[PDB]
């Protein structure tokens, strides 16, 4: 069974937060939603004023790393309207992460509607701004009150939002220079990389950390004793070139264990399929692959995909110690320009489309 | 710099909770609390037992930004109460700060706050045989921020809980293992040798696998080859005649998916001390644990860890087929000596300098 948005209560605030120089995930909206897992079945959902949470101090979430999360966006267009890009699929994978932790399930549809819900208590929060969204944070915890490690029989799910500014604030996409070194490892086969649970995130600070101090941006998590690219900090991994059979195509690792599923990756592989121009593939590509097409020039746009920018460009990427220039600035970045622009109009009610979820 | 166990603040209870047990749900009167931020360490503080405030971003919950330990204190028939080989723990505690980005403190403060705590709920720990308190540090995250990022906030606590013999009636009762390669615990390069939560709510799933085939444990595989590497969240020995007819006791070696644990290493010492059988840490595939059965050349399969101190193994179900582990049969000789050893040692029926008096 699941708790139902019919049963929805809404404790307003009386505390409003002052309203806002937007750093991501720093300014929370004045309510959340909060729903309860036990013996019982769940409880009601209630959104509520943004507060602390109470936990007792052996919670399965915070030693165990009983937790996933997600992450959307909730676009205002221009005529004011706010809608959610394709957060069906963020439902779904938010499931499949539920079910790979042994914690509660629940409807995707009741829940999709409690967030539309809490969206539109706080729809003020919502900057319009160009390139501006609110970030929409959806968590599920395991709350046992036990050291055992099991099934948890009690859980907490929680969604709290975050107003955001544009991603490239210059009005422009600027490209990152990327950390490849096979000494770090995201994820296995095997393993749980291909979930957003929070334990594949908290060892790769140390990663990033290194990244810096090696004068990079983000880290490319590298992948097997072939060196196989499978995504770039937070975000999927694309690839624009001219492949070694002399056939123009985007490229992108296939969903194999080691990748997360993005919901931008999703859409970048529908809007590519649909235009047909070109050939569009999930394969897995090697550090080996990429130099050589460098060497031959036939790379022409490098990019990460996720919902922080929708799509990042690379122009850099040093391999153990050699520098290696991307070319993607230097061909538009045309694809990349391409796929924002077309998800912009989508995104901010330009142009109706089925991947919109009216607020 | 470090908090300092001299800054204690300690806070009694108001209203005491009532003694005695299923572990890890009965917990103790007080808690060690100390708080990390921008200005550094706060003062730690000995207060009653209650929950925390988490701010609905904090990073312990999102990016998994915890870590923990477990270690046991034991009350001696002289009522002293006394904790196994402490400061393992605390070395193995500060690796998996400085692994997840979170912040450094001094061994030997957080140990003596410790000892100071359980000197405060002494009368927590249990005497009958077999028992002990269970010692739960925990270290995490707690940045109001959905960013990926070194925390600039944090909190250390340890709660304690009296724990009941692992045992029923005081005799080593074996386990089934299942050994399914899909299922992989920790890879090379990863974080599996250290003690972070991450690990383990992965192996919920599995465990439950584990349950729905006939089996009570898990058996982590690693590599092509199959590579014996831990057993549950236990580390892994076999007693056995090696291929070169030599007897030995072999344990996987710390090459990066094995958790170093505390009683391994003291069955390891223990054993080298006994200078009686060879001991090696090497890797074990399931290929010469095969063969080895078929042979007739294992004598024991056991876990070592903290819930247990060993636990030996008579089934392994591979590839859809029993495998039976004479480990009863063969006594279990070594197991039953490791066990009476560190029960004498851990009791204070030996003097030892592997024990810490509180
Ligand atoms: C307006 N900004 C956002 O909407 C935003 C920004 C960052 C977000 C964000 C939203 N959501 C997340 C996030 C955090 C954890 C898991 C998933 N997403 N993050 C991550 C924070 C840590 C850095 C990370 N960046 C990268 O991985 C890369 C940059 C360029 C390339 Br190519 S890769 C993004
Ligand atoms: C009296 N009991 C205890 O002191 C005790 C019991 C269990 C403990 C316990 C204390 N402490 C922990 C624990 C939990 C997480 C990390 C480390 N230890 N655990 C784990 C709980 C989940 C099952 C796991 N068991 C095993 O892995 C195996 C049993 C037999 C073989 Br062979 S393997 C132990
Ligand atoms: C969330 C996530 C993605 C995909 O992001 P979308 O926003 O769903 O496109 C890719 N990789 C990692 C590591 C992630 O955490
Ligand atoms: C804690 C732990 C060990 C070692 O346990 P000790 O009690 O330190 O001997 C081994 N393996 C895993 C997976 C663990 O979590
Ligand atoms: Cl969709
Ligand atoms: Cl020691």
């Given at each position: 069974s699941s708790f139902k948005a019919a049963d929805l209560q809404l404790e307003?605030?009386?505390?409003?937060?002052?309203?806002?120089?937007?750093?991501?995930?720093?300014?929370?909206?004045?309510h959340m939603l909060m729903v309860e897992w036990n013996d019982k079945g769940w409880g009601q959902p209630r959104i509520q004023?943004?507060?602390?949470?109470?936990?007792?101090?052996?919670?399965?979430?915070?030693?165990?790393?009983?937790?996933?999360?997600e992450?959307?966006?909730?676009?205002?267009?221009?005529?004011?309207?706010?809608?959610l890009?394709?957060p069906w699929?963020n439902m779904d994978?938010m499931l499949?992460?539920a079910?790979?932790?042994?914690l509660p399930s629940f409807d995707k549809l009741e829940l999709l509607e409690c967030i539309r819900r809490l969206i539109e208590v706080?729809?003020?929060?919502?900057?319009?701004?160009?390139?501006?969204?609110?970030?929409?944070?959806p968590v599920l915890?395991?709350?046992?009150?036990?050291?055992?490690?099991?099934?948890?029989?009690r859980a907490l799910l929680f969604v709290?939002?975050?107003?955001?500014?544009?991603?490239?604030?210059?009005?422009?996409?600027?490209?990152?220079?990327?950390?490849?070194?096979?000494?770090?490892?995201?994820?296995?086969?095997?393993?749980?990389?291909?979930?957003?649970?929070?334990?594949?995130?908290?060892?790769?600070?140390?990663?990033?950390?290194?990244?810096?101090?090696?004068?990079?941006?983000?880290?490319?998590?590298?992948?097997?004793?072939?060196?196989?690219?499978?995504?770039?900090?937070?975000?999927?991994?694309?690839?624009?070139?001219?492949?070694?059979?002399?056939?123009?195509?985007?490229?992108?690792?296939?969903?194999?264990?080691?990748?997360?599923?993005?919901?931008?990756?999703?859409?970048?592989?529908?809007?590519?399929?649909?235009?047909?121009?070109?050939?569009?593939?999930?394969?897995?590509?090697?550090?080996?692959?990429?130099?050589?097409?460098?060497?031959?020039?036939?790379?022409?746009?490098?990019?990460?995909?996720?919902?922080?920018?929708?799509?990042?460009?690379?122009?850099?990427?040093?391999?153990?110690?050699?520098?290696?220039?991307?070319?993607?600035?230097?061909?538009?970045?045309?694809?990349?320009?391409?796929?924002?622009?077309?998800?912009?109009?989508?995104?901010?009610?330009?142009?109706?489309?089925?991947?919109?979820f009216?607020v």
């Open positions: 307003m605030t009386q505390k409003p937060h002052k309203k806002p120089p937007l750093v991501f995930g720093k300014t929370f909206t004045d004023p943004f507060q602390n949470l109470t936990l007792h101090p052996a919670s399965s979430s915070l030693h165990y790393s009983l937790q996933l999360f992450g959307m966006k909730a676009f205002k267009g221009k005529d004011q309207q706010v809608r890009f394709r699929l994978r499949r992460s079910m790979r932790l042994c706080d729809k003020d929060w919502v900057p319009d701004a160009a390139g501006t969204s609110l970030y929409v944070r915890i395991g709350n046992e009150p036990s050291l055992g490690v099991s099934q948890p029989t709290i939002l975050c107003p955001v500014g544009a991603y490239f604030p210059g009005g422009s996409v600027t490209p990152v220079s990327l950390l490849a070194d096979p000494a770090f490892i995201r994820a296995w086969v095997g393993g749980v990389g291909n979930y957003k649970l929070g334990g594949n995130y908290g060892p790769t600070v140390l990663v990033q950390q290194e990244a810096l101090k090696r004068g990079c941006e983000q880290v490319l998590w590298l992948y097997g004793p072939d060196h196989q690219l499978t995504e770039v900090g937070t975000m999927n991994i694309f690839v624009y070139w001219t492949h070694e059979d002399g056939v123009l195509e985007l490229v992108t690792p296939p969903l194999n264990g080691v990748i997360l599923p993005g919901v931008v990756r999703q859409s970048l592989l529908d809007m590519a399929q649909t235009w047909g121009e070109f050939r569009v593939v999930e394969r897995t590509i090697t550090m080996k692959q990429l130099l050589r097409a460098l060497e031959e020039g036939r790379v022409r746009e490098v990019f990460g995909s996720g919902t922080a920018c929708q799509v990042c460009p690379v122009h850099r990427i040093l391999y153990k110690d050699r520098n290696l220039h991307i070319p993607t600035m230097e061909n538009g970045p045309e694809l990349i320009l391409r796929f924002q622009k077309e998800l912009k109009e989508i995104q901010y009610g330009i142009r109706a489309h089925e991947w919109m009216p």
